[PDB]
Amino acid sequence: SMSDVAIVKEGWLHKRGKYIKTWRPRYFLLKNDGTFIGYKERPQDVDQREAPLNNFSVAQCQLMKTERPRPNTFIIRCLQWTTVIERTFHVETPEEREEWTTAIQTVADGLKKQEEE
Ligand SMILES: O=P(O)(O)O[C@H]1[C@H](O)[C@@H](OP(=O)(O)O)[C@H](OP(=O)(O)O)[C@@H](OP(=O)(O)O)[C@H]1O
């Protein structure tokens, strides 16, 4: 339950439009349970956390790193019921990128191990 109610990583990143190719600021939270919730601003109190901007599952995903159109870009491709969603993000260093990427992967491995048994 409670590990399964925790926050793995949170912080700001750039999120690119699907179609309108602009980077936009989002405060994101990586949850143990596999949800990835994003916000316009860093969610102030608890009450603000309850109106998110972005919401997807990242248990069952591919973590890909790219250097276009910006260095330290990454793409998350994650299964979402019957379809995949792909989302493109950006951070200032490859080391930040590598930390975000490794943390997402940590959440997914957590749950792949639970599905196995
Ligand atoms: O702005 P454009 O390029 O037209 O494409 C939008 C944005 O990328 C949205 O990201 P953001 O909401 O951060 O602005 C995204 O929301 P999600 O990534 O949360 O799904 C929309 O997905 P849909 O509403 O799901 O179709 C996608 O259609």
UniProtKB/Swiss-Prot annotation:
Q: What is its main location?
A: cytoplasm
Indicate yes or no for the key word Acetylation: yes
Q: Which residues carry this modification: N6-acetyllysine?
A: K15, K21
A Gene Ontology annotation in the biological process aspect, one of them, is: positive regulation of G1/S transition of mitotic cell cycle
In the UniProt record, which is one GO cellular component term?
protein-containing complex
Q: Where is the PH domain?
A: 6-109
Subcellular localization is given as: Cytoplasm; Nucleus; Cell membrane; Mitochondrion intermembrane space
Instruction: Name the reported effect of K15A.
Output: Impairs interaction with PtdIns(3,4,5)P3 and PtdIns(3,4)P2
Got any disulfides in this one, which pairs?
C61-C78
Keywords for the protein's UniProt record, in alphabetical order: Acetylation, Apoptosis, ATP-binding, Carbohydrate metabolism, Cell membrane, Cytoplasm, Developmental protein, Disease variant, Disulfide bond, Glucose metabolism, Glycogen biosynthesis, Glycogen metabolism, Glycoprotein, Isopeptide bond, Kinase, Membrane, Mitochondrion, Neurogenesis, Nucleotide-binding, Nucleus, Phosphoprotein, Proto-oncogene, Serine/threonine-protein kinase, Sugar transport, Transferase, Translation regulation, Transport, Ubl conjugation
Post-translational modification here is noted as: Ubiquitinated; undergoes both 'Lys-48'- and 'Lys-63'-linked polyubiquitination. TRAF6-induced 'Lys-63'-linked AKT1 ubiquitination is critical for phosphorylation and activation. When ubiquitinated, it translocates to the plasma membrane, where it becomes phosphorylated. When fully phosphorylated and translocated into the nucleus, undergoes 'Lys-48'-polyubiquitination catalyzed by TTC3, leading to its degradation by the proteasome. Also ubiquitinated by TRIM13 leading to its proteasomal degradation. Acetylated on Lys-15 and Lys-21 by the histone acetyltransferases EP300 and KAT2B. Acetylation results in reduced phosphorylation and inhibition of activity. Deacetylated at Lys-15 and Lys-21 by SIRT1. SIRT1-mediated deacetylation relieves the inhibition.
Recorded GO MF terms: 14-3-3 protein binding; ATP binding; calmodulin binding; enzyme binding; identical protein binding; kinase activity; kinase binding; nitric-oxide synthase regulator activity
Tissue-by-tissue expression: Expressed in prostate cancer and levels increase from the normal to the malignant state (at protein level). Expressed in all human cell types so far analyzed.
Claim: Ubl conjugation is one of the keywords in the record: yes
Which parts of the sequence bind 1D-myo-inositol 1,3,4,5-tetrakisphosphate? Answer: K15, R16, G17, K18, Y19, I20, R24, P25, R26, N54, R87
* Coiled coil location: none
Free-text note on domains in this protein's UniProt record: Binding of the PH domain to phosphatidylinositol 3,4,5-trisphosphate (PI(3,4,5)P3) following phosphatidylinositol 3-kinase alpha (PIK3CA) activity results in its targeting to the plasma membrane. The AGC-kinase C-terminal mediates interaction with THEM4.
Q: Which family does it belong to?
A: Belongs to the protein kinase superfamily. AGC Ser/Thr protein kinase family. RAC subfamily.
The record describes the protein's role as:
AKT1 is one of 3 closely related serine/threonine-protein kinases (AKT1, AKT2 and AKT3) called the AKT kinase, and which regulate many processes including metabolism, proliferation, cell survival, growth and angiogenesis. This is mediated through serine and/or threonine phosphorylation of a range of downstream substrates. Over 100 substrate candidates have been reported so far, but for most of them, no isoform specificity has been reported.
Q: State the disease linkage annotated in the record.
A: Breast cancer: A common malignancy originating from breast epithelial tissue. Breast neoplasms can be distinguished by their histologic pattern. Invasive ductal carcinoma is by far the most common type. Breast cancer is etiologically and genetically heterogeneous. Important genetic factors have been indicated by familial occurrence and bilateral involvement. Mutations at more than one locus can be involved in different families or even in the same case. Colorectal cancer: A complex disease characterized by malignant lesions arising from the inner wall of the large intestine (the colon) and the rectum. Genetic alterations are often associated with progression from premalignant lesion (adenoma) to invasive adenocarcinoma. Risk factors for cancer of the colon and rectum include colon polyps, long-standing ulcerative colitis, and genetic family history.
Assembly = Interacts with BTBD10. Interacts with KCTD20. Interacts (via the C-terminus) with CCDC88A (via its C-terminus). Interacts with GRB10; the interaction leads to GRB10 phosphorylation thus promoting YWHAE-binding. Interacts with AGAP2 (isoform 2/PIKE-A); the interaction occurs in the presence of guanine nucleotides. Interacts with AKTIP. Interacts (via PH domain) with MTCP1, TCL1A and TCL1B. Interacts with CDKN1B; the interaction phosphorylates CDKN1B promoting 14-3-3 binding and cell-cycle progression. Interacts with MAP3K5 and TRAF6. Interacts with BAD, PPP2R5B, STK3 and STK4.
Query: Which named protein is this?
Result: RAC-alpha serine/threonine-protein kinase
Q: Point out the gene that encodes the protein.
A: AKT1
Could you say which residues of the full protein are shown?
1 to 116 of 480
